[PDB]
């Protein structure tokens, strides 16, 4: 019901609501474009845009059996994904938005009730970037990293265990060895180590220790 589009221009709200009911009536290319655009600019939308993207994807399959919108969306994302490093340089905020959005898409947009394998390596590419020592020193990126691991970390591991394992080695490494990792960064990494080791769930006692 709530797709979280309040950040949008009033005209565009109408465009998006229209696409949900009658995809065929709107420019799905311009619709995917305004969604990716906004997703890189607003944090709440970046973590929630998957809902509306899924609704539209389903609406088009129902109405015309087409997957044009899915296709414009994936290809526009792939382009932002290819330019991830440049975007990170320009704005850490935009970059964490990109990662949150890609990962939200991986969570929401399925393909015959299965995850898109097209996004498995690109998500790991993103999380491995966050696990680097130049990224870990920024609580903003660590926050981003553990958000994705909380939300889709489990699904990701099923697709590829080898990558998850090597990723978490970087997390232990940063944890023990890095010195400009902050207190918050340390609390965030330690919680996620416990979180995975417990089978991607938060224990009652951990809940008490880490969170208000």
């Amino acid at each position: 019901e709530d797709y979280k589009i309040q950040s949008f221009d009033l005209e565009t709200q109408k465009l998006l609501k229209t696409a949900l009911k009658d995809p065929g009536s709107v420019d799905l290319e311009k619709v995917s474009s305004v969604i990716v655009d906004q997703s890189l600019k607003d944090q709440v939308f970046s973590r929630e845009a998957g809902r509306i993207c899924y609704t539209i994807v389903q609406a088009e399959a129902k109405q015309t059996n087409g997957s044009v919108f899915r296709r414009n969306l994936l290809n526009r994302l792939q382009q932002e994904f290819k330019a991830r490093e440049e975007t990170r340089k320009r704005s850490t905020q935009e970059w964490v938005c990109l990662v949150s959005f890609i990962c939200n898409i991986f969570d929401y947009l399925k393909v015959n009730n299965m995850p898109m394998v097209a996004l498995v390596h690109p998500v790991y590419d993103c999380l491995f970037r966050l696990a680097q020592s130049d990224a870990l020193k920024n609580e903003e990126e660590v926050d981003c990293l553990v958000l994705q691991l909380h939300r889709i970390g489990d699904q990701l591991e099923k697709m590829n265990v080898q990558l998850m394992d090597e990723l978490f080695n970087l997390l232990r490494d940063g944890f023990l060895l890095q010195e400009d990792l902050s207190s918050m960064g340390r609390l965030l990494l330690l919680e996620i180590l416990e979180f995975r080791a417990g089978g991607w769930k938060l224990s009652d006692t951990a809940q008490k220790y880490y969170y208000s």
């Binding site: 296709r71 414009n72 290809n75 393909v111």
Partner: peptide
Amino acid sequence: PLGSMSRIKNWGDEVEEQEMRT
């Protein structure tokens, strides 16, 4: 044709390739 840019890695394509393969 093999190696042509139509075959160059494309998320949209990979997903269709998966959807029909499943």
